[PDB]
């Protein structure tokens with residue numbers, strides 16, 4: 416059984432290596448991040464989300480010291496807007512020549528995002544070495560339990576169809592099935608409190 420707890424600064428190197436490996440060929444990052452130094456760009460994007468969103472204003476869990484990691488914003492993440500505005504320019508630069516694809520996907524998804532306070536899963540990853548052993552479910556469940564306790568929705572977006580069963584088992588339902596012209600099909604998933 417995996418050991419799940421809140422991340423510390425000590426977990427960041429391993430959590431970043433986990434997130435970089437997990438996202439090495441993820442359809443949304445392939446679509447929206449420059450193919451030049453792609454892994455380095457994706458690695459920096461994941462570290463930005465881990466540190467400036469997760470550890471600073473959100474909630475981060477790790478399984479087995481960062482073999483898996485889940486980053487959330489919560490209803491307490493009131494600075495989310497300010498932080499996204501601060502890191503927006505860096506994320507644009509990391510998009511590089513795929514900026515129009517980054518902007519396209521943001522435009523297509525923003526309207527299907529929660530208009531009320533939510534637990535929003537910003538990024539999650541399991542080390543490819545440790546996949547299919549329950550780390551994914553274990554590192555995500557605490558935020559899902561916390562959303563239900565607060566009586567707000569949990570929300571996430573995925574461009575990997577093989578993820579849909581994983582989130583469905585945790586009680587998420589597809590609330591938007593978004594065709595991205597010349598891009599990856601993307602699902603927005605909501606879990607209302609008590610959905611499972």
Ligand SMILES: CC(C)(COP(=O)(O)OP(=O)(O)OC[C@H]1O[C@@H](n2cnc3c(N)ncnc32)[C@H](O)[C@@H]1OP(=O)(O)O)[C@@H](O)C(=O)NCCC(=O)NCCS
Pocket residue numbers: 437438441538539540541542545546547548549550551552553572573574575577578579580581
């Ligand atoms: C999706 C992910 C978070 C699930 O973590 P996990 O620990 O492998 O999942 P668990 O072991 O808890 O449960 C396995 C289930 O996850 C899904 N899954 C998705 N990709 C998988 C993979 N590479 N290996 C195993 N299961 C995978 C399946 O629904 C699987 O059930 P299955 O038995 O029918 O295959 C993880 O595989 C991952 O990080 N993948 C690479 C990057 C990614 O997709 N990030 C998600 C952000 S949208």
Ligand SMILES: COc1ccc(C[C@H](NC(C)=O)C(=O)N[C@H]2[C@@H](O)[C@H](n3cnc4c(N(C)C)ncnc43)O[C@@H]2CO)cc1
Pocket residue numbers: 443444460461464487488492495528535536537538539571572573
């Ligand atoms: C940094 O680049 C990434 C990182 C991860 C992913 C996969 C990740 N899906 C999973 C299941 O892991 C994913 O698609 N992440 C997207 C948004 O869903 C997410 N996001 C958008 N708005 C918010 C938000 N608020 C509005 C408060 N709070 C938290 N996360 C948010 O940030 C990332 C960039 O938009 C895709 C791209």
